[PDB]
Design a binder for this molecule. Structure first.
Ligand SMILES: Cc1cn([C@H]2C[C@H](OP(=O)(O)O)[C@@H](COP(=O)(O)O)O2)c(=O)[nH]c1=O
Ligand SMILES: [Ca+2]
Length: 129
């Protein structure tokens, strides 16, 4: 897998972000994770977390997996990096997301993410409290 550039258009919530990719606006859905909806417990905290991480980033990158690049709603499916740190992984590590929606095409970072979850759960963080 490889990283490609993109620029923030707008934060949406824990696991969706509007980015410009190859000069086109596109809503991206984070691969292999699930945040609570804003209306749910830790939704606001997940939203604020991703928002801060994407707004403070100098360099946003997107990384497609080996499978489907678009979901049935037209959202881009990627791992999103903020100055070299994966947002997908950072949410899991803080207990603001669960590893989820792990489909066979698009599972290159599964183990990495599950490691981060196992340590969030260990530390009883947020969702795991
Ligand atoms: C993360 C991800 C979600 N989706 C779809 C499955 C879910 O379908 P349904 O809408 O039918 O429940 C939905 C979950 O995203 P949200 O958590 O953003 O709702 O998006 C994919 O198809 N591929 C993916 O990699
Ligand atoms: Ca969600």
């Amino acid at each position: 897998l490889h990283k490609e550039p993109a620029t923030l258009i707008k934060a949406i919530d824990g696991d969706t972000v509007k980015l410009m990719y190859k000069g086109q606006p596109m809503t991206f859905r984070l691969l292999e994770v699930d945040t609570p909806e804003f209306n749910e417990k830790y939704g606001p905290e997940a939203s604020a977390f991703t928002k801060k991480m994407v707004e403070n980033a100098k360099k946003i990158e997107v990384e497609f997996d080996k499978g489907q690049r678009t979901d049935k709603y037209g959202r881009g499916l990627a791992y999103i990096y903020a100055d070299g740190k994966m947002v997908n992984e950072a949410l899991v590590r803080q207990g603001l997301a669960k590893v989820a929606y792990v489909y066979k095409g698009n599972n290159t970072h599964e183990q990495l993410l599950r490691k981060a979850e196992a340590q969030a759960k260990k530390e009883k963080l947020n969702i795991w409290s």
